[PDB]
Amino acid sequence: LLDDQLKYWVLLPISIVMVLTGVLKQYIMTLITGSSANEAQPRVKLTEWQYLQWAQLLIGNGGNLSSDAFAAKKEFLVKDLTGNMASFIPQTIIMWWVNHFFAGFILMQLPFPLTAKFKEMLQTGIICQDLDVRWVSSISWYFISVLGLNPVYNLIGLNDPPQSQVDKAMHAMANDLTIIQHETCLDNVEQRVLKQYM
């Protein structure tokens, strides 16, 4: 075959619109998500929330290096305590767009041999029945675009309950963290350091 100089008006617009549409998508998604605060509510509830977070981090952070100081905390603890839209919106709409404006062409030649049923779906524009395995219509180039475009976005540069009973649940975890795990540090540090830095 001999396709004639439509490489300007389709292939470039297809890559170009994918580039702009995704860059816009990241800008739009970033715009849509705004917290701008936690809330504007009274003082107390965030205050005891961060107390709860202090307990939570004590589970991870402070529950390792406190062989002497483990028990001293626990008295205190008990007393003190007690996008899919981003997928759907752009790309489905532009499937309609491309089939609307770009149809009924053989746009290019993929380099690789597909199987016949790939050649079933891709050429809905053309109405030949034994054309070839390799040639493809316009919409196939889109089908290759969406899954291959992550390097482009990198290279241009872009990047990514009950109020009281749950307190009792973490008080039960305060009870659990007493002797569920007493971690072996401030005992093996001499062994570990002599094992290393030689």
Binding site: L2, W9, P13, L20, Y27, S36, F101, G104, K117, C128
Partner: protein, 681 residues
């Protein structure tokens, strides 16, 4: 699709041939009736405004010219074998009246008598004389040629017509050449194609740099280069039924590129002497042959000579390009091997048809021998024939929905033909091995055929279509398609392993096909069929039809599907095909398909359709050569190769610009807003 390029792309010429009778009109006095190109069953009658080339209408009527006479005006015509007579109105060709009881009257048409009344040519220059007071008004030079004055009208809408040269014809009025006509092109027998075309390492680096940097130091959509790149610009060399060759441009509405006159007195065939497409050999009816040099300049007759025996020739069959042989069939049924020139076991088989039979012939040792014969019996008569056109191969098998394959039947040595027998009323179809003579298939139809309407046969890639008229289903035109498959079983390659088997056709150990056939109901009577092509047999092969009225129509191959189903049993019947269009026997006519949208295109009694390949595979040329010449650019599937003539590129560009402006709106905004508001610096 059509409205944009309706008359721009379609390219019609109308020919009348050398005049025989011309009669002035009862009304619209700047108008006559033009009678031309007699033939033993009919002749060409037309109506024409004299002051232009504007033909008003044309008709082929089934009478020898002599019957056509004025009344006692009303242009009476009388059959002589019977007593059948037709009275036709001059102005609008209405058949005023008919009879068989008696002719109304006749008046044999008067002779010119132009001399002694209006004509004098004395100083090698013409002078129109008044009958009295012979003042020699309206004098005019004789051109280089002059044969006759066809017609002259002295009344207020003055007109004069000259047969200046054998083929050039000039209209005049009060002298001034007013219009020009050429009727050398009235009947072409055989055709040929000529195309036109444009016009260590370290040093390579720099010379490439210099030449391309000189290159390096907006769209403008120009049409002329597009034409030549895709092969549209071409020279058609047409051979007339008379002796004339000439080059006609495939672009620019067929301006005559060049015209050469022979002395062969009727033409039969055309051949390029070699693949170079530089030198033709052209055959006389009388038994001469000419060798002609085709150049961008006007041609030159580089040779004339006899054949070995000065005998009348019926036809010529092209033998090998490389071996430079040709076969000549003379009437009296005499065959001559033809070793023409240098052009400055290994058997060959050649096969020819008559109404008496199909014969087959073999060449060996610089001689021709009959290889077999097959004549129909007395009452019978062979009617329609076609061979297998060679084909470049794309797909060895037709597939099914569940990636299953039926292996369409590819045997190259095939021809197909018809037999019609009276009183049996049996159109018999045979699909014969053209080498051996085995039949492989019989299909009769006792459906009350007519034998009076045209029937024709075309041989496809793996399929055959022939068409006939008959009554017993209904009195309607009938297309019959047969499709040839290696095995009717859903997945079987019957005896086609090819690694090294190297099958022999001459012996007859070849596979034999199974077939499936259907037919269809068609509105209009079909004269003749052929097949569209491109260089590669890729698109749907787009059967082209030529009708009785002169109209052309293409219908795709796919609507004619044998193994189609009546569409109750197709519904998610997974095994059938990919998007099997149903069988649907009733094919209504769709005017969108038709070429020659409002053109008349009188093709004459004997005309041919040919398919000329081009590049740009969506497009193909199909040409109707014969009494009238006509061609087109035709798309089987609608244009998929061409980008478009009719994009809304401005809408696309503007939408892209909408993207860019919305970028310009949001990027400073959103970057500042969100980074600084979420950081609350």
């Amino acid at each position: 699709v059509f409205s944009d390029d309706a008359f721009i792309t379609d390219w019609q010429l109308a020919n009348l041939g050398p005049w025989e009778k011309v009669i002035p009109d009862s009304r619209d006095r700047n108008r006559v009736l033009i009678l031309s190109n007699p033939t033993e069953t009919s002749c060409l009658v037309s109506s024409f405004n004299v002051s232009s080339g504007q033909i008003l209408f044309r008709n082929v009527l089934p009478f020898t010219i002599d019957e056509i006479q004025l009344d006692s005006n009303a242009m009476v015509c009388v059959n002589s074998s019977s007593n059948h007579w037709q009275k036709y109105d001059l102005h609008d060709w209405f058949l005023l009246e008919e009879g068989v009881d008696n002719a109304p009257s006749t008046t044999i048409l008067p002779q010119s008598s132009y001399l002694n009344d209006q004509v004098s040519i004395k100083n090698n220059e013409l002078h129109i004389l008044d009958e009295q007071s012979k003042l020699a008004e309206w004098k005019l030079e004789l051109p280089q040629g002059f044969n006759k004055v066809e017609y002259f009208h002295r009344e207020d809408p003055l007109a004069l017509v000259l047969n200046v040269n054998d083929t050039q014809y000039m209209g005049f009025s009060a002298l001034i050449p007013v219009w020009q006509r050429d009727e050398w092109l009235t009947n072409v027998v055989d055709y040929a194609v000529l195309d036109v075309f444009d016009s260590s390492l370290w040093n390579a680096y720099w010379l490439r740099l210099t030449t391309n940097w000189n290159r390096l130091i907006l769209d403008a959509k120009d049409t002329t280069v597009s034409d030549l790149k895709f092969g549209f610009a071409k020279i058609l060399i047409v051979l007339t039924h008379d002796g004339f060759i000439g080059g006609l441009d495939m672009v620019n509405k067929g301006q005559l590129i060049w015209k050469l006159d022979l002395e062969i007195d009727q033409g039969v065939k055309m051949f390029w002497t070699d693949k170079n497409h530089d030198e033709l050999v052209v055959f006389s009816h009388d038994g001469h042959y000419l060798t002609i040099e085709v150049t961008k300049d006007q041609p030159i007759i580089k040779s004339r000579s006899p054949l070995s025996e000065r005998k009348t020739v019926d036809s010529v069959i092209r033998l090998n390009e490389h071996d430079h042989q040709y076969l000549i069939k003379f009437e009296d049924k005499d065959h001559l091997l033809f070793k023409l020139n240098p052009g400055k076991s290994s058997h060959i088989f050649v096969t020819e048809h008559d109404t008496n039979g199909i014969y087959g012939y073999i060449i060996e040792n610089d001689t021709v021998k009959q290889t077999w014969k097959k004549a129909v019996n007395s009452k019978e008569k062979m009617v329609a024939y076609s061979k297998r056109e060679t084909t470049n191969l794309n797909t060895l098998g037709i597939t099914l929905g569940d990636k299953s394959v039926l292996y369409k039947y590819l045997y190259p040595n095939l021809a197909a033909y018809l037999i019609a027998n009276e009183e049996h009323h049996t159109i018999t179809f045979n699909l014969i091995d053209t080498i051996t003579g085995e039949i492989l298939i019989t299909q009769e139809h006792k459906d009350s055929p007519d034998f009076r309407f045209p029937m024709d046969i075309v041989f496809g890639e793996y399929w055959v279509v022939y068409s006939y008229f008959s009554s017993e289903p209904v009195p309607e035109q009938k297309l019959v398609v047969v499709e040839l498959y290696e095995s009717l079983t859903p997945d079987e390659r019957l005896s086609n392993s090819s690694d090294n088997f190297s099958y022999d056709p001459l012996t007859g150990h070849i596979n034999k096909p199974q077939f499936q056939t259907k037919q269809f109901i068609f509105p209009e009577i079909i004269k003749t069929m052929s097949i569209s092509k491109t260089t590669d047999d890729i698109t749907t092969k787009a059967i082209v039809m030529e009708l009785e009225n002169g109209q052309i129509t293409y219908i795709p191959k796919l609507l004619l599907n044998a193994r189609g189903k009546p569409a109750e049993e197709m519904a998610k019947d997974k095994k059938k095909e990919f998007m099997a269009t149903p069988y649907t026997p009733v094919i209504p006519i769709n005017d969108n398909f038709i070429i020659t949208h409002f053109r008349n295109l009188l093709p004459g009694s004997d005309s041919q359709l040919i398919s000329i390949p081009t590049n740009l595979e969506s497009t193909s040329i199909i040409c109707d050569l014969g009494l009238d010449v006509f061609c087109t650019r035709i798309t089987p599937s609608g244009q998929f190769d061409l980008m478009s003539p009719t994009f809304e590129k401005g809408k696309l560009l503007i939408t892209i610009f909408v993207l860019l402006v919305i970028t310009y709106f949001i990027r400073p905004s959103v970057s500042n807003k969100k980074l600084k508001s979420q950081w609350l610096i």
